[PDB]
Amino acid sequence: HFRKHWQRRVRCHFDQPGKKVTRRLARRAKAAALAPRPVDKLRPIVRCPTVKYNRRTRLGRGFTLEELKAAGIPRLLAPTIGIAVDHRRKNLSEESLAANVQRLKDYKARLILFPRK
Amino acid sequence: INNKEGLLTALRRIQLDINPKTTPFSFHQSVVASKRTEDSIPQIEDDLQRELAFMNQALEAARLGRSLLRKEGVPFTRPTDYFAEMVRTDATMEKVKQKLIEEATAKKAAAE
Amino acid sequence: GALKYLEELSKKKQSDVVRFLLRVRCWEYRQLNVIHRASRPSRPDKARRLGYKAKQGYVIYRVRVRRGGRQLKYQRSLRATAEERVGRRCSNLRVLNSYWVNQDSTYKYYEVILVDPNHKAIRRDPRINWICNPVHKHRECRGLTSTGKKSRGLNKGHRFNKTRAGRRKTWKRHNTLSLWRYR
Amino acid sequence: VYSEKELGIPQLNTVTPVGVTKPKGKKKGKVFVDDRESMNTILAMVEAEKQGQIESKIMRARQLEEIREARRIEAEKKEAERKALLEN
């Protein structure tokens, strides 16, 4: 299966350990700037679409406005205290709403919020 | 759901007069076979026998149709001087003839 | 709310009023040069919704391009060549957008909106000062305008697999043999 | 290159009618041509083919027309033969 000019498009990954160090240093840089804050953002629990994977859950893009209000977190403050917000996802079932609301209350219990100035 | 009374009622509303005692064969030109084709088809996956069964059914209708039409006086045979359009173009039938040439050439070249 | 009335009027291009105006204006543009500056948009509603403001730094150049084909068909649009020719004449300006004004049977007429990046009004004002950055030089030449995006096929879905995120880049990605250290 | 006559190639229905076909390997009845009228029709076609291309439109029409009159006379003659044989 080499009917094209494959030799001019061949990528060798000799920088695999070099890029890993670069990625690890970039993660350290984020911790340097956001010193007490985590380097990530809290993300919700979602169910995989297909019937092949619907028995398993994973992480979504951001929290729905309805489940953010049920937790007791204002919309405009959520991206500021380290919570991802997704305005495209709908709940459609109490099961998804309850799981992510409980996730938010667990996040609020562990939070240390400093005065503004 | 098989509403035989409703099905026959629907048929009566759109039925044309096809009775031979008052409607000549030229009007409808439809023939209903006396035997059942599936009774001559033991297995439906047998392509050779299935297509032979359909051909035989159509052959009888064409044979009976010709006899009735010629009795009534409707012309049947296409005259050799009647050139008219067909359902398949000249180019299509030229391709069909060429493929028959190619198969015959391959068969005869193999023997040679 | 005059622009909402103009939007509906521009929808009826074969109406008696619009046909009359387009007939007379087509003759007038034909007496003028192929590329000439228009002091004012002839479709103020269309220019406004494409990003035109009445500031110092916004200009309109209208241009007519010969229509037809090269049986070969140009992969870019007649609107793309109209923008590219106007940009060459006004080499100091940045092409923002363009719109159709008239067709005729020999030509095809467009009005092009251009922004001056070296004007203080544009530089101090946000919403337009992004065009002052050097990464926006000759967008019409690179297919970065609205016409170029349509021609390149930059849409999401299963009907645009081969051409979104770059057609040539996708081909290179699909035709590159990747060999790892631990095979 | 081999002749289509040598190969057992089925005849195809086209704008030119196949007509009533004859079974292979059987008696294809000889239809004799001996009338002066029947010979005239065949002769007109042969002469037209040999002449070929004629630049005059009227002269081309006349060549086609004489074949038409030859066909009409032959059809009339064969019709009269049928009537005489059918009646007498």
Next chain:
Amino acid sequence: GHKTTRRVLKERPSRRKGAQSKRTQFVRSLIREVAGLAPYERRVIELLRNGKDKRARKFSKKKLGTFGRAKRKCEELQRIIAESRRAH
């Protein structure tokens, strides 16, 4: 599939399938009177007034390219006939 408790979701402002804006209908009706009619709509108007409703739909489809477009355009021009008679 699985049994989950369904939820009632808030109406989406992206829905354009509700009562459309009264102002845009006003603008469309006013502009249509001001602008006039296209040459092909003039043909349809003559056909509808003469009673050739069938020909009106066929001609409109040829110009537009869809049965639904032909139906809407014929209904729209029918209203103009009703109003113009009432206005006169």
Next chain:
Amino acid sequence: DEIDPVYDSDDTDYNVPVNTIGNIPLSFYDSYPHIGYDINGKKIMRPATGDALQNLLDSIEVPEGWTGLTDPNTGKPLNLSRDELELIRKVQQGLIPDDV
């Protein structure tokens, strides 16, 4: 109410030819006394032959409705009529798409 399957005065098949000959070339029937068959199975005969002098006159001064085509129904040349010529004149100039 039921439909009456009739051809309105504006259908494509409102006026159908008597020749019962399709889109085939008229090169067939060139050497034949007849031109086509009707729907009853009877052959349509060629009408007549024009004079040679009339053909020369037509060649020198072409008739108004001359088209260069051959009528399938009757092998004589197809000529436009006055009403048809007005229709081509109206369309090619566009001044009057329809009267009144």
Next chain:
Amino acid sequence: DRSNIIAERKNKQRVLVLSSRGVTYRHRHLLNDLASMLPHGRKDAKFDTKSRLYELCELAELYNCNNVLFFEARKGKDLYMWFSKVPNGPTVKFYAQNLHTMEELHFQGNCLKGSRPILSFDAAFEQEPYLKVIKELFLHTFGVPQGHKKSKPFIDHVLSFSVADGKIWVRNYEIREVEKVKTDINLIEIGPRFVLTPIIIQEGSFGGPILYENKRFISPNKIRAELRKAKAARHHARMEQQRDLLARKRQ
């Protein structure tokens, strides 16, 4: 007289051959073949899917057609055929499969375009009441009225309808005459070859009560759906096996 029919008794039949938006090239080839054999029918362009099924009635009322032959495609893969009498008559919905249109170079037959055919029906059409409704609808769609001025004078092909399985098999043959040995008819297939399985019969143009249901129709999507469920079932089986293996490994 606007009927374009010259006969003692006029059987005025006009057919509207209509296609939906998502038809394939093979489906269109089948439609073009059937339109050629129908001199009293006319072709019609793509029909809106979001519209209503009785909008076909005023569409056919627009063209003075009292028979509708409707081609409906799903997913760009499947074909469904509707036969209807436009104002009020019965309507039957089929699933068309095994399509072999013209221009396939293995038929070797031809016939006049518009010639009146011989309709060959099976004995099954005369017994089952629902097959008798389809027989009449077929006789109207492929009737080619006697005195029609677009038909051809001489008859040279036979259209045959057969019922072998729970399906209707449509074949088209050329009547070839051969001189007898001291004339007999030989048949050659010329045209479209397709199978119709009856789904439903409804009184009314494109609605009304259902008078027949197949109760054995296997949808092509049903075959597809089972294949997807099988792939998911295998994955769930492997996941369950791993969970049981982990539990027994702990034990």
Next chain:
RNA sequence: UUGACCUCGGAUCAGGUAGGAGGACCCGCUGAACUUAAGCAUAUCAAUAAGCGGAGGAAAAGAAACCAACAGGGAUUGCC
């Protein structure tokens, strides 16, 4: 007579701006044939090479007229 407005011009007018180079990677246009296989032709090489235009430290894309048929996912990009 005077004065506005519109449109079009002059000026070595006051202040600016573009061209060229580079082109490894990037965005477009244009665009082959050797070669491979097959009665032939389409195909393959290749939506590549050559040619033209336009950027940057990255470029391009990008916040659904999307995927899905789910107990649903949720801008773009890249690896498996």
Next chain:
RNA sequence: AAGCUCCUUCGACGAGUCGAGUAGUUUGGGAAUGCUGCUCAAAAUGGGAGGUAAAUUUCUUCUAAAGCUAAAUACCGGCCA
């Protein structure tokens, strides 16, 4: 100046653009996979895509023809190491 809450009041969303026909090219992709030229040329409980034999074209999911945006990605060229 700003966030929210409530409501006997309102709630504007992109046209020679979709689309139909046709020609060339292109894709694994005639529901035309996409693009371009030409002819015609729209809508507002609208429009696009998809699911569905399930009895009518019900149901699902988005909002095109205006625009900006770092990062993970490429790098035979530039300054070095």
